[PDB]
Design a protein around this ligand. Structure first.
Ligand code: FAD
Ligand code: FAD
Lengths: 494, 499
């Protein structure tokens, strides 16, 4: 009964899609790509909004364009057909405080400058020196303020910590949940806003046999018969046999495997269960929750000075006073515990003014955990969403020379037509955005256990399974290429 | 006759004396060729009593700079102001285009940042695979990334990124690519009187130790147990240990012919190969300074850091687009003079915003430096040479063209126009006791070598100190300061532990 297959890939995200592509390109046939959703792409998904406008609600950028192999590949194509597949949209950040207004490039505040000194401080804090304890990003910032208070103005002490939190939008984590050791990292060059990551997804998906793709099939278990064979079971009853399998489900979905209860959507029952090294790696790495909100307006009636805008959370002069009077990190903690609801100003938010970079009168906004989890939970209540983001949307329009926003969801004033929201934390085949470090996490344990496979036949691919480009679309891509190559060679020696 | 002999009263030599004294060492003296202390640290006085550091000006790497932290503690204790954090957002000016900084369409700072990453990736974990000139490195980048750069970015980015010339005091075709990018361990603090630092240390040991105008010309280390030193005037001192702090450039004369060169010291026996071979790894740049003193501030204090970019050409762009490789671009870059204020980048510190003084402190680099210090006394010519960039700057700062008021001919209808009252220029390249600014790398150079050679010393008795004898803070005031405490400590114990 079990139909024979050379290789069976679980998940049609970019890792799985590139693993299949690699296999076909290497002359391997009789393979399959099992995907639980009714589409390919995984965390790469482009959606349609007001008037046919398109937005990437998952990944949006090609990072590290200096080294990024996926980007380079895409750039080569565009060098021939002259087609526009991406656009370099890095720009000078505009920072907005609710009270003070724009604080970027300010001749008195000089925030970007002290931020740079802070990064250096963090680097001098962990780089080189072995054995330093980890601690949260927030605690790292307080330590910086404490040690350098003699060289900072009251305004810098107040607004710097809030401006530094834009890093929260790189991890999808609040600074008190984020590992200080993982916060900073060098970007290998400018980023490139993909103009349809779906275009990248379809190009790869289409580079191999289409009857290889099986959508809407949710894998529920994988068994290794200690006799060169692997049994896979789709929920739709079908059973398969294969020499090899490449598992590319999110680290969060795979986690479900090391816990009791098998009736969880997306969970895969492994027999034998995943090795202890893999099991144990889950206690040393976690998952962040970066989310997106697409604010679509009728037309562009605001300044297009920049395509990057960050709204700072609220700060107070009281905080400055506490920093001035604290004797040590211990007292600052005590004094800081000063005693109410969560508003659009309770945390930083990162806005992408697509008007300037793509010409579309819309804003792409990034949010972090825990806000992401609350906002996605009420993803349906548009009225409530507008109320929540109304004050910061207004403050932006002010700073960008415009009037308060008008709710046109059902000539001189910005009219909001639609609001789109990500759903990654509530989606069972997602359960979050991507791998992230809580203080104490060592991503290396997971990368090592994943790339060494459960055994010779059961392998892993995905953004959480590799070092360079970890968490990125291109890293997931490379991992796909990594596992398919190892298998092509092995089979090649058949 | 003496226990320790310190040659040079720069900050390296003065710290070394301060230390020895701090460890109760007796009978030590400081021999300085000049008629003052401070070496490359010199604060001069100009119009209306304004003071300027014509040598070192900033405390670099304030996060780790131990000299700076010491000054900071002093300030915490007495409230006296010893420095100010003058880092600021740079204003970049092009003769034709005007301001090109923080531009919504040019975004030069962002690509310059990428430019920096690329440089790290090229020399990263490769053992520094064959260095080239900063200029060459920049061309590689332009070529390899042209597909992702606009025409104007290709034109102005190379010019803007040359601000790095003012950090080395070397033009981009003479500068080592591998050493072009530095750490910058935190903000910089402008010393509000480095003379305060020099004075403090000079006053921390026996005032009778110092001997000014004493040019040392020969250091003889007899296989016995004492060293012999003789100033040019004839006086000969002999001591247990000797800490030589003269600048690398001067020390590099000991390995040349003709002991008639001013400053050159004759070693007996000669400097071992290791040391002499160290000088083969280039070194010594020529950062220079010009101070423009105005009657009063009549320009906008938008920033305290202004950089005028050297002229560029669209013709250059066209060539980057065409070249098919590094060799074709290299040769396709053949344009067949005259040096003007626009032939190189110039760095202007607008002291009005940071220190409330109506002056500009301008930094220049080799080969321009030597030419400008050559005519330092020709005020009229100095004015004509920089007049165009000065006006270009004043225009951008919402002011008028400069008026020459250096002579006793003041006017009354010039209250809205900036009035230049005086110009002050350095003389480091032409001063025999400095012969340049400080250690620097020509492509192919390797500082580690001279550092180890100097650090190791000629022997347990003939030691070295100075901004070229250390790794952390190399070429900086604090590096020289530390190197001084270093040799001091060693010699200290070798004497304290004895009897
Ligand atoms: C909001 C957001 C923004 C992001 N922005 C960026 C960015 O700007 N740049 C960047 O580089 N990265 C970004 N990322 C990360 C990037 O999207 C991911 O690294 C990458 O898409 C992960 O790819 P993958 O192939 O490993 O996994 P997917 O996460 O691609 O997983 C593969 C597939 O497994 C399927 N699957 C799960 N369970 C089962 C099952 N039981 N049976 C069958 N199939 C199953 C899933 O449905 C999924 O399609 C972002 C992520 C999010 C969530
Ligand atoms: C234009 C300029 C700008 C600078 N800006 C900065 C800055 O912003 N920040 C910073 O950290 N550094 C700066 N520096 C560098 C800083 O000035 C030096 O690192 C430091 O002063 C070197 O100190 P030193 O003690 O090693 O040498 P000096 O160079 O201090 O040398 C010591 C002494 O040796 C004496 N000497 C030489 N030959 C003989 C001889 N034969 N006999 C007796 N005595 C002799 C000299 O006259 C001199 O006084 C700058 C330098 C220049 C030229």
């Amino acid at each position: 009964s079990p139909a024979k297959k050379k290789v069976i890939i679980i998940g049609a995200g970019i890792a799985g899609l590139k693993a299949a592509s690699t296999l076909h390109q290497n002359g391997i046939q009789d393979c399959l790509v099992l995907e639980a959703r009714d589409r390919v792409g995984g965390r790469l998904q482009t959606v349609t909004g007001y008037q046919g406008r398109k937005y990437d609600i998952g990944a949006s950028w090609h990072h590290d364009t200096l080294t990024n192999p996926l980007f380079l590949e895409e750039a080569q194509l565009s060098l021939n057909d002259g087609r526009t597949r991406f656009v370099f949209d890095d720009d000078n950040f505009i920072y907005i405080d609710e009270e003070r207004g724009r604080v970027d490039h300010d001749k008195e505040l000089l925030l970007e400058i002290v931020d740079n000194e802070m990064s250096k401080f963090a680097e001098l804090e962990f780089h080189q020196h072995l054995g330093v304890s980890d601690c949260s990003f927030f605690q790292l910032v307080m330590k910086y303020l404490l040690q350098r208070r003699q060289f900072l103005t009251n305004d810098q002490i107040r607004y710097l910590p809030q401006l530094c939190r834009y890093l929260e939008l790189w991890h999808g984590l609040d600074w008190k949940l984020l590992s200080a050791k993982d916060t900073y990292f060098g970007h290998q060059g400018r980023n490139a806003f993909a103009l349809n990551y779906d275009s990248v997804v379809q190009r790869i998906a289409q580079s191999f046999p289409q009857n290889w793709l099986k959508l809407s099939c949710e894998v529920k278990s994988i068994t290794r018969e200690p006799s060169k064979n692997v049994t896979v079971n789709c929920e739709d009853g079908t059973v398969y046999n294969a020499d090899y399998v490449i598992i590319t489900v999110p680290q969060s979905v795979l986690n479900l495997s090391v816990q009791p209860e098998k009736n969880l959507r997306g969970r895969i029952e492994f027999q034998p269960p995943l090795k202890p090294v893999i099991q144990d790696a889950f206690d040393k790495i976690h998952f962040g929750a970066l989310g997106k909100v697409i604010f679509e307006f009728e037309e562009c009636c605001w300044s297009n000075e920049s395509s990057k805008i960050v709204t700072l959370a609220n700060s107070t002069n009281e905080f400055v006073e506490i920093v001035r009077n604290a004797e040590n990190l211990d007292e600052l903690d005590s004094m800081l515990e000063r005693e109410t609801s969560v508003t659009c100003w309770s945390q930083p938010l990162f806005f992408v003014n697509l008007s300037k970079s793509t010409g579309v009168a819309s804003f792409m906004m990034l949010m972090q955990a825990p806000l992401t989890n609350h906002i996605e939970s009420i993803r349906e209540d548009k009225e409530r969403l507008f109320s929540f983001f109304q004050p910061v949307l207004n403050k932006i329009m002010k700073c960008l020379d415009s009037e308060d926003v008008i709710d046109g969801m059902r000539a001189n004033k910005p009219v909001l037509r639609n609001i789109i929201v990500s759903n990654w934390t509530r989606d069972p085949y997602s359960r979050g955005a991507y791998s992230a470090c809580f203080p104490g996490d060592d991503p290396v344990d997971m990368v090592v256990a994943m790339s060494n496979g459960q055994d010779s036949r059961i392998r892993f691919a995905g953004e959480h399974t590799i070092m360079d480009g970890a968490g990125c679309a291109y890293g997931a891509w490379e991992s796909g290429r990594r596992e398919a190559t190892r298998i092509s060679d092995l089979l090649k020696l058949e």
